[PDB]
Ligand binder design. Structure first.
Ligand SMILES: O=CCCC(=O)C(=O)O
Ligand SMILES: O=CCCC(=O)C(=O)O
Ligand SMILES: O=CCCC(=O)C(=O)O
Ligand SMILES: O=CCCC(=O)C(=O)O
Ligand SMILES: [Mg+2]
Ligand SMILES: [Mg+2]
Ligand SMILES: [Mg+2]
Ligand SMILES: [Mg+2]
Lengths: 281, 281, 281, 281
């Protein structure tokens, strides 16, 4: 099942698409729905027609409905390094985390700092080099069970971070610092999570300013281990998103700018598209 | 005005004490109440008797009422360094932040990871050296206006941090990682914020295991500046707590242990007391 | 448009059927929906398939959905005589009301005393002669504007009434004293309200125990006048039902009994069917 | 305990006075509170000072608080005759009810048609002779257990009724047709319900236009019996008011008029005062 959500005259309506192109309008809250599905694959709702999922993907709105975040995730958390700066004993903090038993885990966002397909991501007013970070993300219940997968953009102000790692939070958490969607796919829609293509394109005035790709079979730090360290002594709410870290990193000249289009593709999920918007002083 | 809150048969009731020892039961939500006060000092409620604030402070419960967090703060954020590790060009990341224009700001907690007076703080199952960090904290509205002050304990797993700064989040954010109270005092209850005594005591089986004190006149990074960087491109909800960083740091042999009592005193606020509880595997 | 409602695992879902047999799942509350329609005929929802209105009519349930009252009407009111007992000066109270400027208006039910298609109506434990009263009913807004029409059964303990008119309330108001449905049709679905056939059948063990019919062109007291006296100094909530009085009255030997089936048909609306259930002592 | 309620800036606050003049602010909903009390006399709340019950009684408002209905009763029901018109076989319908096994019971009001101490009762635009009916009233739970007592004014358009008993509903049910308060007293505050004085005064421009009194020891139809017929096959919600019928009836020249003051006194309860307001066309 593939879950999405629209905003229609101030209210949400959630839908699920089945493999056979049939759309179900959801009865339940979508987080609640995902949970039921991971139990017995049962789905409460009515089959609808006249809902053009394919058009929504391309055009974002259609009459009085607009696509958006598939769920409001109570908490978003990130993983780091799963594929002239700070060093401990001539070893770089990043390569140290790469070896150590303990993976990097950071707080990414609250739901109101996230955005969805066809909404704008943001570049901090004071960031000189902000990069999108294309990542596989998992939707979790409170026991760290995987309720499904989605594309996330861990938008990061890389310049503020390289300046000092103690700025990582400021570099990671702010309005529009995070985008995800356009769907959440259920666990069975992905036979093997370590075998999917992730592809970033940046588009400047029609111009392909950056392109790059990589496969999840090149992920060192396994997802279960990331989940284990996330939840250790740390209770998470149902519907939490964990973003598993990126493997595609543009150069220092590829910083984002106002009006750019960021497009991210993951196999079996779809393509997340977000305009970029530079904030002001 | 000094605001506190109790839990009585599954429900909250908020009270305010006025300088003249008269207790008002609150009509409004306490965050909403704080906002009104910072506008015109008006307070909606009834004068109550038979509510023993002084006993509550000492004994935590009394009949069917128990003191707790004075508010549920939608977000808690921390400030760092306002008074053999990682270094950028032979300069330590901490001393670099100390000089730079940009202060350290980190995400501390969500409301359900916080606790109050007479409730237990926690030591991560996998932390070998967790220290309490006694700090002045401010309650904010969405424009970063100061609605009031309180004592906070930024409980931190210092060993996980010194191991690698990329572990700072894991070291800072977990169930019981944060305590505050026992009251929130309104802005006028503190004539000069840079002139107050902060005092930490740790108590092990009746034994004063650690004691230390310092005055806020020794704070380098001013509060307004911390607030400014917090809110920059980063929208905060009403009732957010910013904890302004600690100046009292026990040695490496002073790690917390199960059943310890942590007591923190700040002038004009009161004394926050929390048992400690080591988590398991 | 023709509105109905089902109960599915403890929750309601409202649907509307359009003349062309297409079913819309409702976005809004159905009372709210009716109001919008009487303004501009606009309907907020999604076209559904797999909802078998025609089967629901016949079989009441289907999988996990069951038909019921089309709305919860905040108030139900009745009209009387619009087509050896009590007399004022040798004139019978009923024939007096028939002549007078002022029509009879009585309080009929609250929503929890009403029932719908395929649910049981009730006969008071202490009633010896209870008759169903088949009537055209109107759904009203607070200004007494007609939002639509439906079939109502003003179930009445005629024996308690004929004994004394001061017992009329006891005779009219009790659990299961009132049934309506199976749809509410919008005002435009009925070109002329004074030109419709009403037909009562009572069914005892398969046996047609009573049958009778009449046309609304034989209604003396016009609906607008009934509405006018209802709302005079008497504010009604949105979604109130006014039942306009009956013209079909079985004899004294036709009292209802446990397990009877009451079936009522009105042109363009449909057929309301309710088992009967005698209460106990 | 004696329960009352005020309206303060758009919100309710309920209070209870104990015999010893101490006022408790209520924790619970007041209907819920009454129920608890009838179980074990336990009361959840805080003792308040600065709430001038005695002034509220006299002056209705005080600063930003105003007295009103003590509860919102989901349903109000009335009893009749418990102490040239319509006749069955030369016997008057009223004297027939007086003898019969079955008492009169009628639907009186919904909560939004009721008003309280110091609010205006209404006279129907089209009523020529409306009388107040001073009555003892009981607050009920769903099993018809008596949760307490209060004064009610069954305001009745006697002229519309005497014209035809089928107009009784129109005569009884309309905006402002019903007033009650100023308190609800708990069952133990009244040792013997059949031993209390009820006193009506009507006041026209300072002038005592009517006065009269009677004692409940002159009530024929006992309360339990009224309750029994009320609840028979007729489920009532918690907090229902049953008004037990009046024994004080002014003459045909004593019809109410705009600006009158109606004052009703019942022993151990208090004095209900309501201005009168004639409605228009
Ligand atoms: O700088 C630490 C964050 C690393 C990260 O976000 C990633 O690898 O995706
Ligand atoms: O390690 C960074 C946090 C510093 C801090 O919390 C403080 O100074 O209070
Ligand atoms: O007895 C009065 C009620 C009359 C009535 O309900 C009707 O005519 O439908
Ligand atoms: O006319 C019937 C109502 C009688 C009544 O309300 C009373 O006796 O109080
Ligand atoms: Mg990342
Ligand atoms: Mg700190
Ligand atoms: Mg009828
Ligand atoms: Mg009466």
């Amino acid at each position: 099942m593939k879950l999405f959500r629209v905003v229609k005259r101030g209210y949400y309506i959630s839908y699920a698409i089945l493999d056979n192109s049939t759309i179900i309008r959801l009865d339940e809250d979508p987080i609640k729905a995902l949970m039921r599905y991971s139990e017995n694959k049962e789905v409460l709702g009515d089959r609808v027609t006249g809902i053009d999922y394919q058009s929504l993907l391309k055009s974002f709105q259609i009459n009085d409905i607009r696509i958006t975040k598939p769920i409001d995730p109570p908490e978003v958390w990130g993983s780091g390094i799963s594929y002239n700066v700070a060093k401990i004993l001539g070893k770089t903090i990043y390569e140290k985390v790469y070896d150590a038993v303990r993976p990097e885990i950071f707080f990414k966002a609250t739901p109101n700092r996230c955005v969805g397909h066809g909404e704008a991501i943001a570049v901090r007013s004071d960031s000189e080099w902000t990069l999108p970070e294309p990542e596989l993300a998992v939707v979790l219940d409170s026991n760290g069970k995987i309720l499904g997968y989605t594309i996330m953009d861990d938008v990061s102000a890389r310049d503020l971070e390289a300046e000092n790692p103690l700025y990582l939070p400021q570099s990671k958490i702010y309005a529009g610092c995070c985008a995800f969607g356009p769907v959440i796919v259920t666990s069975d829609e992905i036979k093997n999570p370590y075998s999917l293509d992730i592809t970033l394109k940046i588009v400047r005035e029609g111009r392909v300013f950056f392109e790059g790709s990589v496969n999840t079979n090149k992920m060192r730090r396994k997802i279960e281990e990331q989940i284990q360290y996330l939840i250790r002594d740390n209770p998470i709410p149902d519907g939490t998103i964990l973003t598993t870290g990126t493997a595609i990193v543009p150069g220092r000249d590829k910083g984002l700018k106002d009006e750019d289009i960021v497009e991210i593709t993951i196999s079996n999920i779809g393509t997340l598209i977000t305009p970029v918007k530079k904030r002001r002083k």
